[PDB]
Structure formats: C-alpha cells, structure tokens
Design an enzyme around this catalytic site. Structure first.
Site, short mmCIF file in Angstrom:
data_model
loop_
_atom_site.label_atom_id
_atom_site.label_comp_id
_atom_site.label_asym_id
_atom_site.label_seq_id
_atom_site.Cartn_x
_atom_site.Cartn_y
_atom_site.Cartn_z
N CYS A 44 10.71 15.59 -47.20
CA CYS A 44 9.47 16.16 -47.72
C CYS A 44 8.93 17.30 -46.89
O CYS A 44 8.13 18.09 -47.38
CB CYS A 44 8.44 15.02 -47.82
SG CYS A 44 8.75 13.82 -49.12
N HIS A 63 1.27 18.81 -47.97
CA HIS A 63 2.21 17.98 -48.70
C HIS A 63 1.41 16.97 -49.52
O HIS A 63 0.36 16.52 -49.08
CB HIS A 63 3.16 17.30 -47.72
CG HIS A 63 4.06 16.29 -48.36
ND1 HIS A 63 4.78 16.55 -49.50
CD2 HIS A 63 4.40 15.04 -47.97
CE1 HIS A 63 5.48 15.47 -49.83
NE2 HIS A 63 5.27 14.55 -48.92
N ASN A 78 4.42 12.86 -55.78
CA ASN A 78 5.15 13.38 -54.63
C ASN A 78 6.51 13.93 -55.07
O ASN A 78 7.40 13.17 -55.42
CB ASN A 78 5.30 12.29 -53.58
CG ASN A 78 5.97 12.78 -52.31
OD1 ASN A 78 6.56 13.87 -52.28
ND2 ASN A 78 5.92 11.96 -51.27
#
Ligand SMILES: CC(C)(COP(=O)(O)OP(=O)(O)OC[C@H]1O[C@@H](n2cnc3c(N)ncnc32)[C@H](O)[C@@H]1OP(=O)(O)O)[C@@H](O)C(=O)NCCC(=O)NCCS
Ligand code: NA
Ligand code: NA
EC number: 2.3.1.180
Lengths: 359, 359
Positions: B112, B250, B280
């Site tokens: 990520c 993020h 996500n």
C-alpha cells in the site's frame, strides 16, 4: 555537492542441488552436446528453499564483505521476478531475517535486467537523497516456473542470488553513467502470461501454464539492445573501448555475450562468464558474476567495468562502474542454507511427473 | 545544478462495477452499519479487467492531463502487488499499450505504500540522472486475492488505478523531502503468504490461501509509522504544521486518517478522503485521491501537500510535495475501459461460490 554509491560489499548464494545436462536428457529430447554448444550451459542449480532465503544468504555475505552493521542499512532492493509472496514483498522478509531496522524495502521487477535497474535506482536514490548505505540483491527461483515437457526453456534457467552493499562517498566510484530501457513492442516473445493475477485462481489446471519463448528473436534483439545501450554508456562517459577492463554481462547465452563483445570491439577474454555452472539465473546473473569475478581476482582497484543485461519486457540496460580501492572482503560470513539431502532430479520429481502426466 | 520532478499530469481509472456494503451483507456475517462506522467504507469497485488495463487508462488520462507525447516518457513505474503477470512485468504492458518507445519500465512492490515509494524513486532518478519525464502509476486488482468467507478482510479492499506524469524542472516543485521505510518485525500481521513462488503450483487447493490480518495491531503501527515519518518530513523541511494545505493520505481506514491528523495537530478538513467510495485500493489510493482532490478544486497553486501511506511489510512513508502553477489539465482523454454489463456480485459469483463450497 556530488556524491557516489561505492560498491563496498559483494556476496552470492547458490543452492547445492545441481541439474546437469545429462539429467535433463533423461526426461527430455535433448543432449549435453546441443545445450553446451548452443548456450554454453553445462549445469544449473535448483533451490530447495524459497527466493527470500537465497537472497538472505547473499546479503549476509555482502554485509560481512562490506563490514557494515545492519543498523547502517537505509535501503533494500530485491530484484526478482520469482518472489515467495506478493503481499508482503520479499525485501521486507530479507529485512526481517537480518534484523535491519527501518530501512526502505521494496521488490523491483524488470526480469533479467532487474539487478541493473536496481543498482541504478539505488545509486540515484543515494545521490539525490539521504540514503547512506544500500543493499541491492538479485534473487531468483526460476525452477518454480518451468514447463518440464518443454526443452526450449527447461534447459536455460537456474536458481540463485547475488547481492551488493553500496556506501555513499564523494570519491568518483561505483555506477557512473547508466542506460536502462525497455523495448515493449517485443514483449510477447518472452513471457509466462498466466502466472499472476491474470490466472484463473480456482482452475485446477492453472499450474500448467505456457512459457512463450522465441529464442531466435530474443537472441537478435538482446544483442542489439545491450549493444546500443553499451555504446550510449561508453559514448557519454568519453571512454575508449580499450579502457574497459572487465565486462560483467547477463548470462543468458554464451553466444550473446561473445557477439556483444565482438560487435563492440571488446576483447573476448575481458568478459566474465559463469553461465556454464549456473545457467540463466535472471536478476541474479550480474551480481553473482561480479561476486565471483572479485573472488577469482579478475578485477583490480580502479578498473572500469561494463555491465550489460537484457530480459523479458523486453527490458535492457548497460552501465559503467568505476571500481574503488578495495577488491578484498573486510569480513567473512559463515551464513549457509540448510543442508539438502536431495538431488536436483529428486527436488523436481513431483513437478516433472505432473507436467508429463498432464501432457 | 539542482533539479526537480514536477507533477504535471494526473489521472485515475475506477472500474464501474460497484460492491456495496449491503452486497457483502448477503453472503457474509457483516453489515453496512459495522463497516461504515469502523472503516468509513460504503462502496468499492471490482474490476472486470486486468491490473494492466486499469493502469493503462489512468496513465492515458495523466498523459493527456500533462500534454506530454508518448515519445517524451523516459521512465515508467507501476506500483502494484497484484500484477497480471510476473514475467514480464506489467509496466512493460502499459508501455506496449501506449506505444511509448525505449523507456525504462519496472514494477515496484511495497504494497500500500507503493505509490510513495514510486514517486520517491522516480523523483530521485530524475534529479540524479537523465530521465526528463516519468509516468508513475499505482494500480491494483485486490479482488483477485480476497477470501470471500472472511469478513475481516473481504470488506476492506477494492480495485483501481491512479497515475501521475512527472516533468523535470529547475523550479522547486514536486516531491521535496520524503521519508520512506519498513518496520519488518511486524511483517506477519498483514500477509498472503501462499500466493507467489512459495505456493504449491500443482496442488488443486492452492487457490484457497489465507489472508492473515491482525486489524488492531495494523491500526496501531500504521498511526505510529505514518506519524513519525510525517514528523521527520515536516521537521527536515522547516515547515510549521499550519503551512500544510492538504493531506493526501493512504485510504485504509478513516479512523487511521483522523488519528494521524489529530496527533500531528493538522486540521481534519485538510485531509482528502474518498475511502467511502473506493475502499482500500492499495498502491492506487494516493494517486486516485490526488487526482480527485485536483478535480474537486481542493488544491491551489503553490500549496504544500503532505502525503502519507502504510502497508504490508510493514512499509511506511511520508512526503512533502510543493505544487506548481497549474491545477488544470492541459488536455482530456476519452480513454475508457470496455463496457461491463455485469454487477459486482455477478463478477465475484464464481470466486464466492468456490470459497463457500471449499469451507
Ligand atoms: O538436429 P536433427 O533434427 O537432425 O536431430 C534432432 C537432434 O537435434 C537436437 N535439437 C534440435 N533442436 C533442439 C532444441 N531446440 N533443444 C534441444 N535439442 C535440440 C536434439 O538433441 C536431437 O538429438 P539426436 O541427434 O539425439 O536426435
Ligand atoms: Na580503464
Ligand atoms: Na503553504
């Protein structure tokens, strides 16, 4: 103020199980004569451990060779196209195994050109920002991928890892100019398209994937790609070709290496070649070859190295490395893989059986 | 002479098929109430195409937004942990799709945090060497990985791509200081260990892999990791916190984002949040969020942006971007994904059935 990334540590990890040309000859319509004459390969290594384990041992040897402490490492790049896992990356596994705190850690995939890409990337990161020591590792377990019914590719590839440690300095050493790239129009001639997220996850036959490989086109484009890249490197750096002391090339085919030197006018005996022992280990070829060139006394202080590689993509690259003062390790590591009481045929037994039974 | 990598182009690609919280509620012991209150997520996108296709459309939008020609691109980085294929890399597939000649092209895996890693890497490559324009893309198809019997992870993740184009300049713009790293000791709390070369290639059950996920530890370490990284970035840059105009974080959990701002003393309304729409999307979160912040008029010329991310590894990072003069696209692209005449449930049908039948 201009800075540089000196190669202060080098290391390798070759797994012990050895697959000979004759071994391949027992389950495949091929021969030692054909393989050795067309490719130069006589043996390759087949790993009994995961890619991250090979990478860890090579890195351990490189760190000892550089005399750096794990707390000094700021950056870890693992060049691989055969990682144990994708979540997380295997640079973090290597980091975890070595107890390196906090370092940036990523995997880089540019296939067989991966170590060059990684050396370039690490070098530029160090020059432009605050990374003082880097670990760059090429590591592969290509035996995972092979189609054991397909002689064209099954005899070319092996497993292994090589690593370097880079240390920031003001001396003009390490990777100087580099030219890396990719000729994407030829992407389809060297590919395993159905391992990855394109594969049908729940198909029971999803393991029986094609390894597309047009040997002749690959051969031709590799010579041209590496050749052009090397010329750009030599030209930009103002070096005459006689000033190159050692060539450390990617080890895909001895005839590619010879043709590269021939067309550049570099003497054949300047190329370090270990393809006969290991085969094509993808991202690992260059750093293993560098490691062994140093072990075997082929590189002298202040030598000019030409590095060149090519791979799936079609990725390509060349680089000029100016060596520093030291060609000897500061320390040794007793780090080893766990013992393997199996032959290479033993290890591949199941995979070979499945590939044959499915055909 | 000091150079910089200005963000001159931005773009996104969200696939159209939408998985709602209620959709998940029909085959799983969960609810819209639990998911929205704990995570902030209401919807995610589920791709009907491969990761490379999402990456290609976002890149097309970014190129049109930058007004650059494909022949000017020297470097392509795709940040992903869900690539179509490992041999070759998917940066080369994006290159092939766009007709970009010769550019260096690699995939980067830092989960990520991948886009931050990629932005840093591209920026340093450009500052230290001869790359004048770069394409940096975060692209993911995480729906490939999910265990449709496991509510803990199945509701968190989505598919998508975001891209930027970087242009070399002497103006002090683009990514300034950046602090990226990895806390490797916590590597095991967020992992799919058995997709990759560690998996048994010929086991028919090899698709039924575990997605290890310790939500609470991940939450805690992410706040601390991003927080520390952001503080280093702010400190080194001599910026007061009030001088940050926009946070592009993020998008893993809205409560992580809120806690990050709270502990740094950054006002909540400075954080761009789109997690409610997309979930996500790993490496894609930051560049999609950046793209949409720009589309929605949240960023002004000369703004100071704080970027922060975290991921499997456990990788982490923060960065300061100084925006330049232009917040408007130079051109638009009519590039689109192929039409999808299916729902998100339709697309996942087979995968869900297999996961339930195997349990
Ligand atoms: O050459 P021919 O077609 O005359 O004969 C086939 C031989 O070429 C070799 N050969 C030809 N193409 C080959 C390839 N792509 N890979 C390996 N071996 C090959 C075989 O080893 C075979 O050996 P044999 O002489 O024991 O039959
Ligand atoms: Na010389
Ligand atoms: Na400001």
């Amino acid at each position: 103020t201009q800075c540089y990334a000196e190669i202060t540590g080098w290391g390798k990890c070759l797994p012990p199980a050895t697959l000979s040309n004759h071994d391949l000859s027992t389950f495949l319509d091929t021969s030692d004569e054909w393989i050795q004459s067309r490719t130069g390969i006589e043996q390759r290594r087949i790993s009994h451990v995961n890619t991250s384990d090979l990478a860890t041992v090579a890195a351990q040897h490189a760190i000892a060779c550089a005399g750096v402490s794990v707390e000094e490492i700021d950056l870890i790049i693992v060049a691989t196209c055969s990682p144990d896992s994708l979540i997380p990356n295997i640079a973090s596994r290597v980091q975890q195994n070595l107890g390196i705190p906090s370092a940036a850690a990523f995997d880089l995939n540019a296939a067989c050109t991966g170590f060059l890409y990684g050396l370039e990337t690490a070098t530029r990161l160090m020059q432009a920002s605050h990374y003082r020591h880097a670990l760059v590792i090429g590591a592969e377990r290509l035996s995972f991928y092979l189609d054991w019914t397909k002689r064209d590719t099954a005899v070319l590839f092996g497993d292994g890892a090589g690593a370097v440690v880079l240390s920031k300095t003001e001396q003009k050493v390490g990777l100087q100019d580099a030219q890396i790239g990719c000729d994407a129009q030829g992407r389809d001639i060297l590919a395993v398209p159905k391992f990855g997220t394109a594969m049908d996850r729940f198909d029971a036959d999803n393991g029986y994937w094609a390894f597309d490989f047009v040997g002749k086109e690959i051969f031709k484009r590799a010579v041209r790609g590496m050749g052009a890249a090397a010329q750009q490197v030599l030209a930009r750096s103002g070096l005459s070709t006689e000033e190159i002391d050692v060539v450390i090339p990617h080890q895909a085919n001895i005839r590619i290496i010879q043709t590269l030197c021939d067309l550049a006018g570099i003497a054949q005996d300047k190329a370090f070649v270990n393809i006969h022992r290991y085969g094509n280990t993808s991202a690992a070829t260059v750093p293993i070859a560098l490691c062994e060139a140093l072990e075997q006394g082929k590189i002298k202080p202040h030598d000019d190295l030409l590095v060149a590689a090519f791979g799936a993509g079609l990725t390509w690259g060349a680089g000029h490395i100016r060596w520093g003062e030291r060609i000897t390790p500061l320390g040794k590591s007793d780090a080893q893989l766990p013992s393997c009481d199996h032959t290479a045929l033993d290890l591949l037994s199941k995979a070979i059986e499945h590939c044959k039974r499915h055909q």
